[PDB]
Design a protein around this ligand. Structure first.
Ligand SMILES: Nc1ncnc2c1ncn2[C@@H]1O[C@H](CSCC[C@H](N)C(=O)O)[C@@H](O)[C@H]1O
Ligand SMILES: [Zn+2]
Ligand SMILES: [Zn+2]
Ligand SMILES: [Zn+2]
Ligand SMILES: [Zn+2]
Ligand SMILES: [Zn+2]
Length: 440
């Protein structure tokens, strides 16, 4: 489960032996590893584990000489060992930075590294380590230490603290790359250029870790803790998914529905009375028999899916065809669930980690925004006067207390979802006109 200290460390990347282990590395950074039996058996963590703690990822790079310390936050700090700053002021601003960045993301920090060596040596200057401690002021894990008061604090209660306590890290060069950082990074990303500074290294180093671990495909096995409104959000998206698809079907009576990017083969309108077809790039083994393996791009499938309507519910493709229903996460929304990722994309960590290409308007060229409405054919068990309440009773005169209340709940569900950063799009020929007809 944990990364053994006895695992060999490839030194090839370090400007001083060859046949080295983590134990011998850590000792050389200036740290005593006796805390194996206290929940901190290694400063470095397994890739497996790093992925579980992606919310904690902070890229770190370093350019007696002065030292420039860079981070994925685009912050650079210069330390005069004794432009530059005293080490006491630097190490305070580090803890300040990390706390600010991570207080609402993780219970720890993972330093993501392209190990040139000079940064691993620097760690002893701003990192203390020991047994796993809880915070003095709350029951949160301790991430910081104050030499002044000899107390330990989480990211929330770290104000004025100077040393980072029990940080985790990974050297990416230990994943069998060749060539320098920028060579490997620039393959997958052209949003992060070099300015020949540490922060740019830190940024790229994280950007590339994110690519290797997330861009590839969704790992449905790994799940992430609730840090926000996940449950409210995910519930509301499903309530909408149902309402929207049901309505599109009733309106235009599509013979078939191409549910693209459905790896679980589950109908969101179970009692449909429509040919329901499931597709996905990575169908789940358990249900793979009902799901066609397919990676949609317009270039490859503009001459397919001619019949009926395509459902792309958070299936984020180059360009959607004209006969589409789409829910798409606007990667530009600022959120604790929305982490920056590869090539202007972003890593949306909700229940699972979902890497998304950057939100581009050009994808929706063949579509229009899906306007808000509420539709119900169900029975009718502060009087609401809405043109967008498409029920029997609304055109009738006043609307029943049942539908009236369902509207106010669906509306909150819509507003919850839009606020969460999702956007709704539909075939340009869509209109509620036909849903009014379903009554007369
Ligand atoms: N270009 C593409 N073509 C087909 N499936 C894709 C795709 N890009 C991503 N996917 C798949 O679409 C899914 C997106 S996340 C799950 C979305 C699902 N329809 C739902 O409502 O929960 C993943 O299974 C992913 O592998
Ligand atoms: Zn970051
Ligand atoms: Zn605390
Ligand atoms: Zn990048
Ligand atoms: Zn709607
Ligand atoms: Zn009614």
């Amino acid at each position: 489960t944990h990364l053994s200290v006895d695992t060999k460390f490839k030194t090839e990347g370090l400007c001083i032996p060859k046949d080295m282990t983590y134990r011998r590395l850590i000792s050389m950074m200036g740290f005593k590893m006796n805390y194996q039996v206290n929940g901190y058996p290694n400063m470095f963590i397994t890739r497996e584990e790093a992925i579980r703690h992606v919310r904690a990822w902070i890229g770190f790079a370093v350019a007696n000489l002065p030292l420039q310390l860079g981070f994925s936050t685009g912050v650079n700090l210069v330390a005069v060992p004794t432009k530059g700053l005293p080490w006491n002021v630097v190490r305070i601003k580090i803890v300040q930075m990390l706390s600010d960045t991570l207080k609402n993301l993780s219970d720890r920090v993972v330093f993501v590294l392209w190990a040139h060596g000079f940064e691993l040596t620097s760690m002893k200057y701003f990192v203390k380590i020991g047994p796993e401690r809880t915070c003095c002021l709350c029951d949160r894990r301790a991430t910081c230490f104050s030499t002044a008061s000899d107390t330990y604090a989480c990211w929330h209660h770290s104000i004025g603290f100077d040393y980072v306590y029990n940080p985790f890290m990974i050297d990416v060069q230990q994943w069998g790359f060749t060539g320098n950082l920028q060579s490997n990074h620039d393959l997958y990303c052209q949003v992060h250029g070099n300015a020949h500074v540490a922060s740019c290294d830190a940024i790229m180093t994280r950007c590339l870790a994110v690519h290797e671990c997330f861009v590839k495909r969704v790992d449905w096995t790994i799940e992430y803790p609730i840090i926000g409104d996940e449950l409210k959000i995910n519930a509301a998206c499903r309530k909408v998914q149902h309402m929207v698809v049901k309505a599109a079907l009733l309106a235009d009576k599509f013979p078939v529905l191409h549910d693209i990017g459905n790896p679980k083969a589950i109908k969101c309108v179970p009692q449909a009375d429509v040919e329901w077809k499931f597709y996905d790039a990575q169908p789940c083994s358990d249900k793979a028999y009902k799901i066609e393996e397919l990676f949609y791009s317009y270039a490859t499938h503009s001459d397919k899916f001619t019949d009926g309507v395509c459902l792309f519910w958070n299936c984020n493709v180059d360009r959607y065809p004209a006969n589409s229903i789409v829910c798409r996460f606007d990667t530009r929304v600022l959120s604790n669930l929305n982490l920056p990722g590869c090539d202007g994309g972003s890593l949306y960590v909700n229940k699972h980690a979902f890497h998304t290409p950057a939100f581009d308007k050009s994808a929706f060229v063949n579509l229009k925004q899906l306007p808000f409405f509420y539709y119900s054919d169900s029975p009718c068990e502060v009087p609401l006067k809405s043109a967008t309440c498409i029920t029997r009773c609304n055109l009738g005169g006043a609307v029943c207390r049942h539908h009236a209340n369902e509207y106010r709940l669906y509306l909150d569900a819509y507003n919850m979802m839009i606020s969460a950063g999702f956007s709704l799009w539909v075939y340009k020929q869509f209109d509620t006109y036909n849903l009014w007809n379903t009554f007369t």
